[PDB]
C-alpha cells in the first residue's frame, strides 16, 4: 500500500538512542571496555579509590577487572540465574614499617550486567532500574517563611554523603549554622577555619547591619584550637573534648572526601552560584595541620548580599530543571557499591588487628560478603529496581525511560506537595507534561522527553538549532534549563524559506515565557514538536486535538497493549513507530549488505559481503514477565537480497518493522440499544471469525519435591485413589506430556507427600475394617490446574538432584516447571482502547447480520458511542476515523506528524478521492441511489448537512467529505434516520482480561492468627467486606446480613462449620457465635496487661473462651 | 512459628521481642546472684526496661528495635492493635468474607431494574453447598461428597448440574458492591440471571448510584445465606426499592445519557 506523509517540518536530527539513558549510564559506571590504566575516577573506579587505601599495616588498591559471564542471558532466564560478570581487584598489602609488599588479585563476587536493551536479569526475572530525580547538590538560597526580609541559605551534598547545613540570620542578629539538628553561631566555625576579625571585617563590611551580629569578641579571643574544642563540645555534649577526637569529628564532618561528598554537579553548581573555585567536593580542607575554608565565606557573602538587596543575587527555583538532576542506573549502583565497599573496609580494618601481624595476605584480609550482599540488596529489593514491564516492546522502552521522584534517598508519598508534582516550565523538552500516572503518583513518576538526554552531571538537556542573523543553522546545541534561560528560542513551526526565517513576527520563548519577537531577536529555535513529549505521547496522531487529560490516558494505555497474533500498524501513524521497534529491539535486522541463504521458522541465515555466513536464531513463543508471548517471525525469503539495516524478522507487536499494538477496525460512531452505554463497546463476531484481537499467552507453573522429616516427597505417576481417567496425560514420571489440553482440576505434575503422623479416628477404624483396605503411607499433593486457567502444555522442564549441572537450594530433591499456553480470543469484559484515551469494555458481541452496515453490504466492526466524545474533548479520534475512512477506500496509510499533521482541507481532498471509489464503482456496476439513501438525504438536508437542490450523488459526496455515510440497520433493513461517522480506527486490546479478573469463592483458606479468609484470586481468597461496606449494610439496616459477614462468613469457626453443614443438609443457617478475631483482641489486650471482661447484665463475667483458658 | 510450603519457618516479631526480654531478664538475675557492681546492675536494669518498652510499644521511646540486618522495626502489640492495618480497623470493623466473588462488569441493558447478570461459573462456587444439596435431591449424585468430587473437575460438569443451580438460585438475590462504597447505595441487591461468559451484567439505571461505568470497572458479589439475610436483601436492599436518594429525596435511579438522548 501507499504511505502518504504530511508535514512541512524537516528534522535536522533524528531521535537519540532511546535507551541510551540506561546504556551509557551503566557503561560509564562499569568501564569494562576501558583498559584499567586508562580508567577515570568515576563509577566503580571512583568507589574503589574512595574506599582505598585502608590504613591501620596498609592495604592499597591497584585496579579492578571484570570477567566474562559464566552463563549467557538466555540460560540465566532459563535457570533463574543472575546475568553477571566476575569482579576481581588487584590489592597490594604493605607494611609501612617493614617495607614488605604482598600483592594478590582477590575475587569480590559478581556484578550484574546490563543486557542489550538496557535491562537486567535478576534471578531469572527481567528488571529495570528506574532513574531517580532529586534536588541537585549545591548551595541554594530560599526565603525564610517566617520573616519576608530574610533568607535561609541551604548547603546540600549528595544523598547519604554529608549533612545539610542551614545558614540563617536570627532575629537577635547573629548568624546561626544548623547542622545535624543542632544550631550554633557560624562565627565559631569561622574561627575554627582560621578567620580573624580583620579579614572578616574587610571581607564582609560592605553590608553594614550584619557584620556586627557576626562579630563575637570571645570567639575572636579564643585560639583556633580552643574554638575547635568549644565547637566539639557544642556539637557532641557529654563526650570528653579530646583534641584529636575533635579534629577527627570536625574533619569527617566538613572536610573528609570519604564522609562528605558534593556531587560533581554540586561542586560545579556551588562554583557557578558563588563565583568561586573548589579544590575538591568538600566545604573545607585540612592542610598542614589546620582547616582552610572554601565554601562557607562565599556562601555567607552571598547570603549577606541577598539580604541587603545587592544586584546580582537571586533566590533559587528549586523545581527548576537546572536544580533537579537524574541519578541513573550507573549512579545508583555505584552508591550501593560504595556502601558495600565501606563495609568490606570495616571488616578489613577489624582484621588488621587480629591474626598474626607477621603473616597476612590480601586474600586473608578481604571478606567480600558485605559488597556481595550490598549489590544483591540493591538489585533484588530496591524500590527503583522494578519487575520489567515487558507486555509489549513499547512497555519496556517506556519503562526504561521513566523518572521517579520516589525511592531511597527521595520523597515518600506524604512528602509530595504541589511544587514537586507540578509541571515546571523547564519541563519543556526535558520531561513530558502528559505521560504520568493517574492517582496518588501523579507528578512523581514521569517520562523522559523524546529528544531529551541526560548529561554527565545528571541534568536533562534538550536540543535547539542555532539561529544567527535570520539563518537557521543545522548545528544543534543541547542545553540544560539554566542555559536555556539565556536565549530567545523560536518555535519549530515558524515559517522558513531554505534556512531563512520567513515571517515578520515569530513565536519564541524567553525563560519559558512566550513572546512575539522579530527574526533579528531569534537566537535559537526548536528542533521539532516531538521533543516536547514522551515517546508514548508522540505515538498519538492528531494529539493537537486531544485534551491533555485523555491524551495521558491513551499514552499510558499504549503500554498495556497485548501483542496480537495478527497485529497491524495503525492506518494513521505519527512517524515514530519504526524507531520504537528498532530501539526496543523487538524486530531483527541485517548487519551488513548481503543475501538471505536460509529462512526457517526458527532461524535466518545471511551471507554478507564479507563471505561470512551469519545465523540468527528466532525467539519463538517465549513467555514475557506478564505472560504475553514474545515471538519473532521471519519477514524475508530465501535468496532475497538485503542491505545494511533492512528487516529480517518482526518482533511481537510489529508489522514489517512498524509498531503494531492493536488492529485497524471499521468503526461506526453511534448509540446501539444501550450496549455501548457508559463507554461499553459493541463488536462484531466477524472479529472473532478472522482472529482479530486474539492473543497468545503462556503461564508457568512450578512444583518442588523435597526431603521431609517423614519421608521424600516423590514426583510420581503413582497417586493413590486416582483413576486412569485422571492420569491419562501423565508420562512415566508423573509430568504432563507436551501438547495435551489441561482444564481446571487437571494434574500437571503428580506428587506424593508422606502422611503426617496421626491416629485414625474410631470412625476411620470401623470404616477401614468394613472395607478391608490399608490406609496408604503417602498422600496426593499434586499440582493441579487453578480455577479458570488451563490450555496446552508446550514445555516441561525437569530438574533433579544429582544429575549433571544442577544444584537446588538445600533440601529440595527435584523441581518441575510446566508451561501452559492459550490462544485467548476476544470476549465480553475484555478491555479495548484507542490512542486518544477512549477506553471501554466489550459488552455485546453481535452476529454479523445485526451490525450496522454500508449499502454495499460491508458490516462495521466496532460500534462506539458518540456520548464518549464531547465531555472528554478528544476529537483526535474523530479526525483519525475520518482519515481512516479515506484510507480504507483508497487502500493506503498515512503518517500524520504531531502538531504538524494532516489538516482538514487535505483530509477533505482524500475523502473526495475516496468517495469517488465508494460511489462510482456502484454507479458503474449498474445501480442508482437507494430509496432509503434518499430518505436519509432528506433528513440530512433537514439537519443542515447538505445543500437542498443538489443531486443525490452530490449530496452524498457532501456528506462523505464530513466523514458521514449512510448506514443500514442490519436487523430491519430500514436505514439509520441520519448519516453516521464510519471509518477505520486503530484500537488495541489492553492487558486487563476477564479470564484474569473473574474470581469466586464459597469456602477456602483462612489466615493463621485472625482465622479470616485469605485475600487474592491467587490464593482462592474472599472479598474484603471492609469498614465502608459495613457502613452500607448498617445504613440499610440489614443487621442479619451484616452479622453474617462478621461471623458466619469469616470469623466464627463454629458457626461457619455449622453453616456449611446446614446448607449441604438443607437446614436454615445456625445462630452465629463469637468471632475468633475478637478472642484474639481480648488475648492481645491481656498481653498488654489489660483485663478485658465480657459481662452479663448482672455485671458477672461471661467466658467467651468456654473454660479453655481458666484454671 | 509455622512451616511454609517450602519447609521454611515464618515467625512473629513478638517472639524475637519476648526473646530479648527473656535474655535480659535472665542475665539480670544472674548478675544479681553473682553480686555484680552497681554500674553493671544499673545498665542491665535499664536495658530490661527498654526491652519491656520495645515488647509493648516498640518505637514509642527510643530507637525502634529492629531485626538483625534490617531497617524494619519489629511489630509490637501496640502496632498490632492500632492503625489502619491494626486489629480493630483491619479485622473487627471489617473482614474478608466467604461466599464472595469479583468480576468485570458489563452494561447489560436488557435486564429489568431488579436484576443482574451473574456468570455461571461464578454462581457455581457462590452457591456450591446449595448446589450440592440440590444435586443430592435430584438424582445427579448419591451424596454431598460425590457431588463435590463431581464438581471438582471442569470436564465432569454436565447440564443437569446447571439446571440444578437454576433451581437453587430461584428467587434468591445477591449483593453487588463497587468500591469505593460512598453511601448505602454502593451495595444493592439483585435477582441474578445466570449467563455464559465471565462478566457481571449491571443494570443501566444503577450505574449512577454506584458511580459505575464500563471502562474496566469490577464489582464484588456476596450471597446472603440465611432466610433472614435474604429477606433483608430483598425487602430493604433490592435495587428497584431504592429509587430516591436518602441524601436529597430526589430520584437517583433516573434516566441517563443514552435514555435521555433517545427520549
Amino acid at each position: 500500500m501507499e504511505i502518504k506523509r504530511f508535514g512541512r517540518i524537516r528534522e535536522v536530527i533524528p531521535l537519540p538512542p532511546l535507551t541510551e539513558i540506561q546504556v551509557e549510564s551503566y557503561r560509564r559506571a562499569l568501564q569494562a571496555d576501558v583498559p584499567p590504566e586508562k580508567r577515570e575516577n568515576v563509577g566503580i573506579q571512583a568507589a574503589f579509590r574512595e574506599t582505598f587505601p585502608i590504613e591501620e599495616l596498609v592495604l592499597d588498591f591497584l585496579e579492578y577487572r571484570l570477567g566474562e559471564p559464566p552463563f549467557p542471558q538466555d540460560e540465566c532466564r532459563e535457570k533463574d540465574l543472575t546475568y553477571q560478570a566476575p569482579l576481581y581487584a588487584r590489592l597490594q598489602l604493605i607494611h609501612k614499617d617493614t617495607g614488605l609488599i604482598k600483592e594478590d588479585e582477590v575475587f569480590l563476587g559478581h556484578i550484574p550486567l546490563m543486557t542489550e536493551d538496557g535491562s537486567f536479569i535478576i534471578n531469572g526475572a527481567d528488571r529495570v532500574i528506574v532513574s531517580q530525580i532529586h534536588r541537585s547538590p549545591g548551595v541554594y538560597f530560599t526565603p525564610d517563611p517566617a520573616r519576608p526580609g530574610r533568607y535561609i541559605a541551604s548547603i546540600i551534598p549528595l544523598p547519604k554523603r554529608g549533612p545539610w547545613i542551614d545558614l540563617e540570620v536570627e532575629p537577635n542578629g547573629v548568624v546561626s549554622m544548623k547542622v545535624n539538628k543542632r544550631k550554633f553561631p557560624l562565627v565559631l566555625l569561622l574561627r575554627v577555619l582560621g578567620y580573624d576579625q580583620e579579614t572578616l571585617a574587610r571581607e564582609l563590611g560592605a553590608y553594614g547591619e550584619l557584620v556586627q551580629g557576626l562579630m563575637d569578641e570571645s570567639v575572636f579571643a579564643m585560639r583556633p584550637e580552643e574554638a575547635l574544642i568549644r565547637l566539639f563540645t557544642l556539637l557532641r555534649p557529654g563526650d570528653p573534648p579530646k583534641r584529636d577526637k575533635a579534629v577527627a569529628y570536625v574533619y569527617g564532618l566538613i572536610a573528609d572526601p570519604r564522609r562528605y561528598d558534593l556531587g560533581e554537579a554540586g561542586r560545579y553548581k556551588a562554583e557557578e552560584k558563588l563565583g568561586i573555585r573548589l579544590s575538591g567536593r568538600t566545604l573545607a580542607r585540612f592542610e598542614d595541620g589546620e582547616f582552610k575554608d572554601e565554601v562557607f565565606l562565599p556562601t555567607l557573602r552571598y547570603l549577606f548580599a541577598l539580604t541587603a538587596g545587592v544586584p546580582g543575587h537571586e533566590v533559587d527555583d528549586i523545581d527548576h530543571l537546572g536544580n533537579r538532576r537524574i541519578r541513573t542506573v550507573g549512579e545508583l549502583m555505584t552508591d550501593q557499591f560504595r556502601v558495600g565497599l565501606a563495609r568490606l573496609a570495616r571488616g578489613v580494618r577489624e582484621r588488621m588487628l587480629m591474626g598474626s601481624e607477621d603473616s597476612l595476605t590480601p586474600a586473608k584480609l578481604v571478606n567480600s560478603r558485605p559488597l556481595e550482599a550490598a549489590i544483591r540488596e540493591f538489585f533484588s529489593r530496591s524500590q527503583l529496581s522494578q519487575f520489567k514491564d515487558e507486555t509489549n516492546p513499547l512497555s519496556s522502552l517506556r519503562h526504561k525511560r521513566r523518572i521517579s521522584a520516589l525511592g531511597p534517598g527521595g520523597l515518600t508519598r506524604e512528602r509530595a506537595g504541589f511544587d514537586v508534582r507540578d509541571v515546571h516550565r523547564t519541563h519543556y523538552g526535558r520531561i513530558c507534561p502528559v505521560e504520568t500516572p493517574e492517582g496518588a503518583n501523579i507528578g512523581l513518576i514521569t517520562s523522559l522527553a523524546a529528544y531529551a538526554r541526560v548529561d554527565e552531571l545528571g541534568f536533562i538537556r534538550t536540543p535547539y538549532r542555532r539561529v544567527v542573523g535570520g539563518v537557521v543553522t543545522d548545528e544543534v546545541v543541547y542545553m540544560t534549563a539554566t542555559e536555556e534561560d539565556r536565549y530567545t528560542i523560536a518555535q519549530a513551526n515558524t515559517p522558513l524559506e531554505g534556512n531563512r526565517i520567513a515571517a515578520e513576527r515569530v513565536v519564541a520563548r524567553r525563560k519559558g515565557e512566550p513572546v512575539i519577537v522579530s527574526p533579528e531577536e531569534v537566537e535559537f529555535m526548536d528542533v521539532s514538536p516531538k521533543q516536547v513529549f514522551s515517546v508514548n505521547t508522540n505515538l498519538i496522531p492528531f494529539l493537537e486535538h486531544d485534551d491533555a487529560n485523555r491524551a495521558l490516558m491513551g499514552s499510558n494505555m499504549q503500554t498495556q497493549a497485548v501483542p496480537l497474533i495478527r497485529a497491524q500498524a495503525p492506518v494513521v501513524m505519527t512517524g515514530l513507530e519504526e524507531r520504537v521497534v528498532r530501539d526496543s529491539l523487538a524486530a531483527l535486522y541485517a548487519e551488513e549488505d548481503g543475501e538471505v541463504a536460509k529462512v526457517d521458522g526458527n532461524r535466518i541465515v545471511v551471507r554478507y559481503e564479507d563471505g561470512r555466513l551469519v545465523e540468527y536464531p528466532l525467539r519463538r513463543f517465549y513467555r514475557s514477565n506478564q505472560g504475553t508471548a514474545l515471538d519473532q517471525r521471519p519477514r524475508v525469503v530465501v535468496g532475497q537480497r538485503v542491505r545494511k539495516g533492512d528487516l529480517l524478522a518482526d518482533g511481537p507487536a510489529s508489522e514489517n518493522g512498524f509498531l503494531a499494538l492493536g488492529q485497524n477496525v471499521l468503526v461506526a460512531i453511534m448509540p446501539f440499544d444501550g450496549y455501548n452505554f457508559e463507554d461499553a463497546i459493541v463488536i462484531s463476531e466477524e472479529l472473532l471469525k478472522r482472529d482479530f484481537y486474539t492473543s497468545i499467552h503462556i503461564e508457568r507453573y512450578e512444583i518442588e519435591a523435597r526431603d521431609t522429616k517423614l519421608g521424600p516427597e516423590r514426583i510420581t505417576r503413582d497417586i493413590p485413589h486416582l483413576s486412569e481417567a485422571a492420569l491419562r496425560d501423565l508420562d512415566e514420571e508423573g509430568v504432563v506430556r507436551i501438547g495435551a489440553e489441561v482444564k481446571p482440576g487437571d494434574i500437571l505434575v503428580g506428587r506424593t507427600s508422606f502422611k503426617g503422623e496421626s491416629e485414625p479416628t474410631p470412625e476411620e477404624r470401623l470404616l477401614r475394617s468394613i472395607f478391608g483396605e490399608k490406609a496408604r503411607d503417602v498422600k496426593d499433593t499434586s499440582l493441579r490446574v487453578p480455577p479458570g486457567e488451563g490450555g496446552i502444555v508446550v514445555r516441561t522442564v525437569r530438574l533433579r538432584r544429582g544429575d549433571p549441572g544442577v544444584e537446588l537450594k538445600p533440601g529440595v530433591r527435584e523441581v518441575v516447571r510446566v508451561y501452559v499456553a492459550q490462544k485467548r480470543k476476544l470476549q465480553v469484559g475484555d478491555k479495548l482502547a484507542n490512542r486518544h484515551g477512549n477506553k471501554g469494555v466489550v459488552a455485546k458481541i453481535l452476529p454479523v447480520e445485526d451490525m450496522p452496515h454500508l449499502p454495499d453490504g460491508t458490516p462495521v466492526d466496532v460500534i462506539l458511542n458518540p456520548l464518549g466524545v464531547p465531555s472528554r474533548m478528544n476529537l483526535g479520534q474523530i479526525l483519525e476515523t475520518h482519515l481512516g475512512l479515506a484510507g480504507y477506500f483508497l487502500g493506503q496509510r498515512y503518517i500524520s506528524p504531531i502538531f504538524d499533521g494532516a489538516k482538514e482541507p487535505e483530509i477533505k481532498e482524500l475523502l473526495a478521492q475516496a468517495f469517488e471509489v465508494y460511489f462510482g464503482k456502484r454507479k458503474g456496476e449498474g445501480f442508482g441511489v437507494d430509496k432509503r439513501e434518499v430518505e436519509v438525504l432528506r433528513r440530512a438536508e433537514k439537519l443542515g448537512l447538505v445543500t437542498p437542490g443538489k443531486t443525490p450523488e452530490e449530496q452524498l459526496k457532501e456528506l462523505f467529505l464530513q466523514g458521514k455515510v449512510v448506514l443500514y440497520d442490519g436487523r430491519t433493513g430500514e436505514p439509520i434516520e441520519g448519516p453516521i461517522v464510519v471509518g477505520q480506527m486503530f484500537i488495541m486490546k489492553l492487558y486487563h482480561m476477564v479470564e484474569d479478573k473473574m474470581h469466586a469463592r464459597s469456602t477456602g483458606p483462612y489466615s493463621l492468627i485472625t482465622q479470616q479468609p485469605l485475600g487474592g484470586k491467587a490464593q482462592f481468597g474472599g472479598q474484603r467486606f471492609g469498614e465502608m461496606e459495613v457502613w452500607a449494610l448498617e445504613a440499610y439496616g440489614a443487621a442479619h446480613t451484616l452479622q453474617e459477614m462478621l461471623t458466619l462468613k469469616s470469623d466464627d469457626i463454629e458457626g461457619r462449620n455449622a453453616a456449611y453443614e446446614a446448607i449441604i443438609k438443607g437446614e436454615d443457617v445456625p445462630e452465629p457465635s463469637v468471632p475468633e478475631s475478637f478472642r484474639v483482641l481480648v488475648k492481645e489486650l491481656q498481653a498488654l496487661a489489660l483485663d478485658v471482661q465480657t459481662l452479663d447484665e448482672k455485671d458477672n463475667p461471661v467466658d467467651i473462651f468456654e473454660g479453655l483458658a481458666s484454671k | 512459628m509455622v512451616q511454609v510450603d517450602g519447609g521454611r519457618f515464618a515467625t512473629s516479631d513478638l517472639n524475637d521481642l519476648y526473646r530479648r526480654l527473656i535474655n535480659r531478664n535472665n542475665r539480670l538475675k544472674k548478675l544479681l546472684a553473682q553480686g555484680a557492681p552497681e554500674i553493671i546492675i544499673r545498665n542491665e536494669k535499664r536495658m530490661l526496661q527498654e526491652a519491656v518498652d520495645a515488647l509493648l510499644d516498640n518505637g514509642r521511646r527510643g530507637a525502634p528495635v529492629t531485626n538483625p540486618g534490617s531497617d524494619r522495626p519489629l511489630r509490637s502489640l501496640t502496632d498490632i492493635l492500632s492503625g489502619k492495618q491494626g486489629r480493630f480497623r483491619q479485622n473487627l470493623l471489617g473482614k474478608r468474607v466467604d461466599y464472595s466473588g469479583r468480576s468485570v462488569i458489563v452494561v447489560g441493558p436488557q435486564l429489568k431494574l431488579h436484576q443482574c447478570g451473574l456468570p455461571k461459573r461464578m454462581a457455581l462456587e457462590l452457591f456450591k453447598p446449595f448446589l450440592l444439596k440440590k444435586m443430592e435431591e435430584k438424582g445427579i449424585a448419591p451424596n454431598v461428597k460425590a457431588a463435590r468430587r463431581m464438581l471438582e473437575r471442569q470436564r465432569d460438569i454436565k447440564d443437569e448440574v446447571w439446571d440444578a443451580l437454576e433451581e437453587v438460585i430461584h428467587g434468591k438475590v445477591v449483593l453487588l458492591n463497587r468500591a469505593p462504597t460512598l453511601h448505602r447505595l454502593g451495595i444493592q441487591a439483585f435477582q441474578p440471571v445466570l449467563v455464559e461468559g465471565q462478566s457481571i451484567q449491571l443494570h443501566p439505571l444503577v450505574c449512577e448510584a454506584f458511580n459505575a461505568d464500563f471502562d474496566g470497572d469490577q464489582m464484588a458479589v456476596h450471597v446472603p445465606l440465611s432466610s433472614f439475610a435474604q429477606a433483608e436483601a430483598r425487602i430493604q436492599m433490592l435495587s428497584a426499592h431504592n429509587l430516591l436518594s436518602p441524601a436529597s429525596g430526589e430520584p437517583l435511579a433516573k434516566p441517563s445519557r443514552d435514555i435521555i438522548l433517545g427520549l
Binding site: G238, D239, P240 | I39, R42, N43, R46, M47, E50, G62
Partner: peptide, 14 residues
C-alpha cells in the same frame, strides 16, 4: 536519651 552514651558516661567516671 541514648543508652550507649549514658553507659559510656557512667563508665568514664571510675
Amino acid at each position: 536519651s541514648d543508652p550507649v552514651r549514658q553507659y559510656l558516661h557512667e563508665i568514664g567516671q571510675v
